[PDB]
Amino acid sequence: QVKDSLEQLRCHFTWELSIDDDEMPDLENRVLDQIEFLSVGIHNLLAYVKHLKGQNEEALKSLKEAENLVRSLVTWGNFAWMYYHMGRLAEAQTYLDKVENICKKLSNPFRYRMECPEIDCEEGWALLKCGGKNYERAKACFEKVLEVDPENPESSAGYAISAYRLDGFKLATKNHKPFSLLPLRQAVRLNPDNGYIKVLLALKLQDEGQEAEGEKYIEEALANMTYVFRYAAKFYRRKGSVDKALELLKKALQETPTSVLLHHQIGLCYKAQMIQIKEANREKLDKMIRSAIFHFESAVEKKPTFEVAHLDLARMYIEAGNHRKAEENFQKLLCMKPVVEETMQDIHFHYGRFQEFQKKSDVNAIIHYLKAIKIEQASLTRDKSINSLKKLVLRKLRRKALDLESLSLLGFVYKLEGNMNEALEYYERALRLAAD
Amino acid sequence: QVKDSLEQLRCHFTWELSIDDDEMPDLENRVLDQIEFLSVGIHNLLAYVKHLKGQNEEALKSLKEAENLVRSLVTWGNFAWMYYHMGRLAEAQTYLDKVENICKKLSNPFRYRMECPEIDCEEGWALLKCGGKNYERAKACFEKVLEVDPENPESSAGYAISAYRLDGFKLATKNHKPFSLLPLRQAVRLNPDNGYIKVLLALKLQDEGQEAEGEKYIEEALANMTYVFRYAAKFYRRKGSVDKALELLKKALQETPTSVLLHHQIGLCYKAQMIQEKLDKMIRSAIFHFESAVEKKPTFEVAHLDLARMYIEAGNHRKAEENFQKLLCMKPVVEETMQDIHFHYGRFQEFQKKSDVNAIIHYLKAIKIEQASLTRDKSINSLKKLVLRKLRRKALDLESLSLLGFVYKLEGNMNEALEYYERALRLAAD
RNA sequence: AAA
RNA sequence: AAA
Numbered sequence: 047q048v049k050d051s052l053e054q055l056r057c058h059f060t061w062e063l064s065i066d067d068d069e070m071p072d073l074e075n076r077v078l079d080q081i082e083f084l085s086v087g088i089h090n091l092l093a094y095v096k097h098l099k100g101q102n103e104e105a106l107k108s109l110k111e112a113e114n115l116v117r118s119l120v121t122w123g124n125f126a127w128m129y130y131h132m133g134r135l136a137e138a139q140t141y142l143d144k145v146e147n148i149c150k151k152l153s154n155p156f157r158y159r160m161e162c163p164e165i166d167c168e169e170g171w172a173l174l175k176c177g178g179k180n181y182e183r184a185k186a187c188f189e190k191v192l193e194v195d196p197e198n199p200e201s202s203a204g205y206a207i208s209a210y211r212l213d214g215f216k217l218a219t220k221n222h223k224p225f226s227l228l229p230l231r232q233a234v235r236l237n238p239d240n241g242y243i244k245v246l247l248a249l250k251l252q253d254e255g256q257e258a259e260g261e262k263y264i265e266e267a268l269a270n271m272t273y274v275f276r277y278a279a280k281f282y283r284r285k286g287s288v289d290k291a292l293e294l295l296k297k298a299l300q301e302t303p304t305s306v307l308l309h310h311q312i313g314l315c316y317k318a319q320m321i322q323i324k325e326a327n328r329e330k331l332d333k334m335i336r337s338a339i340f341h342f343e344s345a346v347e348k349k350p351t352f353e354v355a356h357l358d359l360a361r362m363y364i365e366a367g368n369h370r371k372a373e374e375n376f377q378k379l380l381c382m383k384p385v386v387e388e389t390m391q392d393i394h395f396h397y398g399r400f401q402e403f404q405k406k407s408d409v410n411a412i413i414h415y416l417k418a419i420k421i422e423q424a425s426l427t428r429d430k431s432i433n434s435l436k437k438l439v440l441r442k443l444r445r446k447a448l449d450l451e452s453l454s455l456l457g458f459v460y461k462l463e464g465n466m467n468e469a470l471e472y473y474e475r476a477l478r479l480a481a482d
Numbered sequence: 483q484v485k486d487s488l489e490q491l492r493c494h495f496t497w498e499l500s501i502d503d504d505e506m507p508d509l510e511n512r513v514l515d516q517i518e519f520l521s522v523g524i525h526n527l528l529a530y531v532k533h534l535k536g537q538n539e540e541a542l543k544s545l546k547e548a549e550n551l552v553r554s555l556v557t558w559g560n561f562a563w564m565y566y567h568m569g570r571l572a573e574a575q576t577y578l579d580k581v582e583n584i585c586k587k588l589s590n591p592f593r594y595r596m597e598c599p600e601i602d603c604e605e606g607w608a609l610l611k612c613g614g615k616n617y618e619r620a621k622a623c624f625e626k627v628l629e630v631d632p633e634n635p636e637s638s639a640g641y642a643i644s645a646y647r648l649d650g651f652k653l654a655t656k657n658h659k660p661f662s663l664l665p666l667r668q669a670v671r672l673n674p675d676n677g678y679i680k681v682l683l684a685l686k687l688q689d690e691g692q693e694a695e696g697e698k699y700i701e702e703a704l705a706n707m708t709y710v711f712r713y714a715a716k717f718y719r720r721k722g723s724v725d726k727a728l729e730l731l732k733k734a735l736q737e738t739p740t741s742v743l744l745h746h747q748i749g750l751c752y753k754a755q756m757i758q759e760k761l762d763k764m765i766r767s768a769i770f771h772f773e774s775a776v777e778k779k780p781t782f783e784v785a786h787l788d789l790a791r792m793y794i795e796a797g798n799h800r801k802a803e804e805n806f807q808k809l810l811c812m813k814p815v816v817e818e819t820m821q822d823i824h825f826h827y828g829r830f831q832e833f834q835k836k837s838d839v840n841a842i843i844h845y846l847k848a849i850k851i852e853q854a855s856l857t858r859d860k861s862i863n864s865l866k867k868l869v870l871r872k873l874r875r876k877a878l879d880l881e882s883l884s885l886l887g888f889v890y891k892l893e894g895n896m897n898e899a900l901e902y903y904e905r906a907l908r909l910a911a912d
Numbered sequence: 913a914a915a
Numbered sequence: 916a917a918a
Contacts, residue, residue: 217917217918218918276916280916307916309916310917313917314917317917345916349916352916354916355917358917392918426918
């Protein structure tokens with residue numbers, strides 16, 4: 047009945063952290079980066095990471111190191127689970143009792159499950175670090191605390207970061223009601239010296255057309271002694287100061303060389319510089335393309351679930367005139383099932399354009415514009431897909447004006463546009479040709 | 483010469499009366515019925531009918547009888563026109579001058595066209611007797627007099643009758659808002675001893691759910707004393723008192739035996755009691771009266787349709803097919819009637835002849851008359867039910883899928899319509 | 913004048 | 916972390 051008891055402990059072993067096998071190397075790197083450049087909860091996660099890679103002994107060393115720095119119950123729960131897997135269950139029962147004693151003394155309603163806001167935050171931070179699939183739960187953890195202690199600085203920050211990252215998933219949807227602006231303001235108010243939270247508020251203000259006010263918080267963060275640099279670089283890049291951003295990123299890269307986020311941002315800077323020259327040399331343009339591919343390729347190498355970086359890679363190979371590699375990466379993208387499923391719209395859309403312009407294959411452009419549209423969630427890319435589809439369909443009707451398929455697709459377009467009368471008119475016109 | 487002068491008179495010859503050829507015998511009969519049981523206008527109209535029969539000499543008699551009883555101008559005008567066709571130019575000019583002086587005396591703006599409400603009414607009574615193709619003009623003639631004399635009793639009745647008959651054409655159209663109730667009420671008030679108007683108000687009240695108040699006018703119109711029996715028989719027929727309605731019709735038929743309206747109402751009574759081995763005696767009677775009304779007025783589309791439907795009751799599919807085919811070749815004045823023609827022929831093909839294909843053809847044709855009505859809805863539902871039968875035996879039929887999407891469009895369910903249109907276009911991709 |  |  048030890049297993050039955052261990053499953054009631056609140057710790058990383060029972061939090062159902064969604065960690066894909068391919069995300070394991072990157073996760074470990076991101077944890078270690080946090081050890082140095084950002085303290086108990088972080089070593090607990092590192093111990094769990096070490097466990098999942100078959101290094102229980104080295105995991106205990108991270109748990110024992112975590113105990114040196116009520117929040118101890120998570121560390122005791124990981125110990126219990128650890129000794130269980132190692133066959134040393136006699137020691138596991140000890141830490142089970144240490145948890146029960148604290149639960150007993152605090153009038154906790156459960157034998158081993160400690161109900162308190164400290165553990166709620168512990169669960170939120172772990173989830174917030176192990177991938178976007180957990181962000182809804184992570185927000186719930188911090189929101190649970192703020193429901194009773196609305197001015198709590200820790201949960202106020204965790205809630206704002208979670209809400210901010212969830213707004214990023216929906217940044218391109220048409221609804222686009224960003225609910226993280228005020229939570230961030232409150233997070234900055236209750237953590238006045240936390241630059242990480244200040245930069246996020248600035249980026250969210252930049253998202254809302256308030257770039258000016260956002261930059262004020264950017265400078266305040268740069269006044270305190272990689273996380274500020276990596277996110278500040280994004281603010282400057284999107285503002286236009288691409289050279290300033292590249293500088294901040296290369297500095298941050300010295301501290302955290304394995305950061306896929308930095309490599310991705312770095313590539314986006316070179317891409318921005320490639321456009322600068324284009325709108326204006328050839329050795330410089332080819333130089334930046336070769337550098338952008340290098341970093342996009344480095345991000346996809348370290349975190350192959352980085353679907354978006356994989357897409358910027360395939361698109362950059364097009365800029366380089368390397369169609370065999372663009373096709374190669376697009377074929378990988380087409381096999382994915384992104385966490386943010388809306389991303390698949392952009393995959394199909396940009397592959398549709400690739401077919402339309404590089405391959406001059408309107409048949410396949412139509413196929414992939416439809417697949418992007420088949421993800422019904424309204425977005426900017428879905429509108430572009432409907433318009434591009436409308437263009438090719440109209441190009442096929444100016445040749446063969448009685449094409450059954452083109453009359454159906456056009457009537458389908460009008461349906462998506464909300465014009466139902468013209469949709470029925472073309473569907474009916476097509477069904478008459480079908481009568482043969 | 484004198485022609486351009488004749489075309490300016492206001493009389494039957496210049497009122498563009500729309501009288502189909504097949505309707506001439508029934509018109510002459512209804513004119514004579516009015517002469518005897520309902521008076522200068524009817525003889526003028528009677529004179530015009532004779533001229534159309536090729537009996538110009540017979541017409542001069544009815545015009546001479548008319549003057550024996552400013553409305554004289556209509557008669558004088560018909561005289562002018564009658565003598566022109568007969569070659570008596572000098573005699574026509576004599577009546578042209580008689581009209582010119584009256585116009586001249588009354589400070590009339592035109593030389594021969596007399597403007598006045600009396601002749602506006604005379605024109606209305608003529609239009610109102612020569613078929614429903616003229617009732618819109620009739621209503622206008624009477625609405626012109628009320629425009630400046632809102633209490634004129636004559637025009638108040640002519641406008642109420644025209645408005646009532648027009649409301650009859652649109653009686654089955656959806657959301658039809660009758661504009662004939664208050665015009666009838668006013669007509670009743672300004673003509674208290676005219677039972678004709680009273681019964682019409684009762685029937686219109688019966689049409690508007692106020693049958694109780696309507697029956698009051700029925701008995702009141704019957705107190706003072708054939709035309710009152712026609713429309714009273716309808717009131718009691720539609721109320722359920724079929725026995726009393728049959729009595730009134732039989733009495734009225736003795737006075738005006740050639741009335742197609744009476745034969746039609748009789749056949750409906752026999753049909754009503756039928757619903758409640760002896761039916762053959764009843765079905766044979768209803769067929770005899772529908773057949774009689776159609777014989778006397780071939781353009782009686784509605785009666786011709788009740789005839790075809792009764793041969794179905796009699797089990798004579800041969801005569802039903804024959805009568806329906808004559809109906810299908812018609813172009814009724816009330817085009818909405820064509821919805822019922824196709825609908826009932828569609829049911830005949832569906833049930834009696836066991837041909838859903840032709841049932842579809844005709845349900846569609848009834849629907850293609852876009853005017854919303856009761857029959858159009860039944861045609862959509864019949865088409866729907868019928869197409870669903872096709873889809874239960876065979877789920878992937880292109881036409882059946884297209885028709886079911888077309889049905890949902892008519893019903894206003896645009897989502898289901900787009901659906902079945904789409905999953906049908908997928909089959910079309912082969 | 914069916915409805 | 917593209918948009």
